[PDB]
Amino acid sequence: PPYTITYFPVRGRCEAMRMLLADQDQSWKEEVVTMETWPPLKPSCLFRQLPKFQDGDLTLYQSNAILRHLGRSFGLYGKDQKEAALVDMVNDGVEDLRCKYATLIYTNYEAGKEKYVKELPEHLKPFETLLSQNQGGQAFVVGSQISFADYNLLDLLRIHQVLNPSCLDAFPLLSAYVARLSARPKIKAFLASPEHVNRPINGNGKQ
Amino acid sequence: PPYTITYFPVRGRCEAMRMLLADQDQSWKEEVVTMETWPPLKPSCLFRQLPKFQDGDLTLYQSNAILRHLGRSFGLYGKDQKEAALVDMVNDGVEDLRCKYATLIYTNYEAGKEKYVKELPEHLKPFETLLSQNQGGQAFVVGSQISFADYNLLDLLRIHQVLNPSCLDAFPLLSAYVARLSARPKIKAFLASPEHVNRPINGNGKQ
C-alpha cells in the first residue's frame, strides 16, 4: 500500500478491482484521466494504455495482472496449486467475453447487438456449469472461498444484465450468484456509492 | 504429470507451451483433433474451445492458464511476488498482440496486412524497452531467469518475423533476444524437429 488507480472516468476494466479492494477493506486513491491529460500521459504508459496501478513502489499495468497481484496479496487465489490454475482458467474465460463485449460496445454496437445477444447464452453456460459442479452453486466460482475471478465475473454478469436484462433467465445459479455476491455488505456499499453510480460503464455512452 | 495436449494440427496457441515443456525436459502426448472430430468434442470442452491440457488428473483449458500452471510447477514465475506481478503484465501484453495477430490472420489477412505491419513497431517497442531496463537487454524479459512469459513472447516474435521478416530490424535487443533464446539447445532441438517443422503456424494457410 498505498494504492492508486489511474484510469479514465468509466467503470470499464477497473470496476472489478475496485470491488475487490472495497470488499477487502482497503482504501485507494483515484487519479482520473480526462481527454486532455490522456494524449501526454499515453507515451509514458508501458503498453500505452490504462489502467495503471501503484501499490507502494510497484507500478503495474494490465488489469488482469493487477487482479492477480491483489489476489496474491489478499489470498484470493485458491487454496492450493490446482485451485490457483482453475481460478486462472475462469478469469481467462471472463477476459475472453470481456473482450467481445468491448468490441461490440466500441465498434459495432448498433448492428452487432442482436447477434451478440443471440450468441450470449453459449458464452454464459460454462460459468453456470462451473457453478453447478461446485458445492451446489452455493459458494464461489472455484472452491469455498472468494478469488479475484469472482469479482471479475460478478462485474461481467452485471454489465451484461444492463446490456440484455433477461440474459440470465436460462441460468439460475448465475442469477442467484449475482444476487448473493452483490449483497456482500462492503460490495453493496460500494455499488451504492456516488463514485460508482456516477460514472458510465463505458467511455462512449453505449451500454 | 503425465501431460497430454489436445489441439488442432497447428502451432497456434500451443507452441509456447510445447517449447516450455521441451526446455524443461518433459515429454507429453499430442492428441490431434481434426475437422471431423472437433464438432462432437466441442460441447464437452468447458469454454467450447481447444487447447485442452491434462496433467495427471487435472484437466485445464485456456492457453495462458496452462502456461501459468506450468510456470508454477517449474519455478518459471519470477523470484518473488513483485516479479510475479511483472511476469503477469508481460504475458498479458503478449496476449493482446497475439489476439490482434489472430484477427489479421483469420478475418482480414489480405486487406489488413499493410495497416497491421505499419502499427507493429508501436506494439513491439514496449518489449524492447522492458529488455533495455533489464541488465541492458542481455537477460530475459523479467529478471535473471526464464519465465513462462519468455516462451510466449519468443513464439510471438518468431511468428511475426514470418509475417514481416524485417520487423525486428529497428529493435536490436529483441532481435538479439530471439537469437539467444532460440539457440537454447533444447528449444533449438525442438525448433528443428519435424513435429514442429511440419505443423503450420495457423489453421487457415496464412502466415
Ligand SMILES: N[C@@H](CCC(=O)N[C@@H](CS(=O)(=O)O)C(=O)NCC(=O)O)C(=O)O
Ligand atoms: N489489456 C489491457 C487493455 C486496456 C485497454 O484497452 N485500455 C484502454 C481503456 S479501456 O478500454 O479499458 O477502458 C485504453 O487505455 N485506451 C486508450 C488508448 O488506447 O489510447 C488491460 O487489460 O489492462
Ligand SMILES: N[C@@H](CCC(=O)N[C@@H](CS(=O)(=O)O)C(=O)NCC(=O)O)C(=O)O
Ligand atoms: N482463450 C482461449 C482461446 C482458444 C481459441 O481461440 N481456440 C480456437 C483454436 S486456436 O485459434 O487457438 O487455434 C478454437 O478452439 N477454435 C474452434 C472453435 O472455436 O470452435 C485460449 O487462450 O486457450
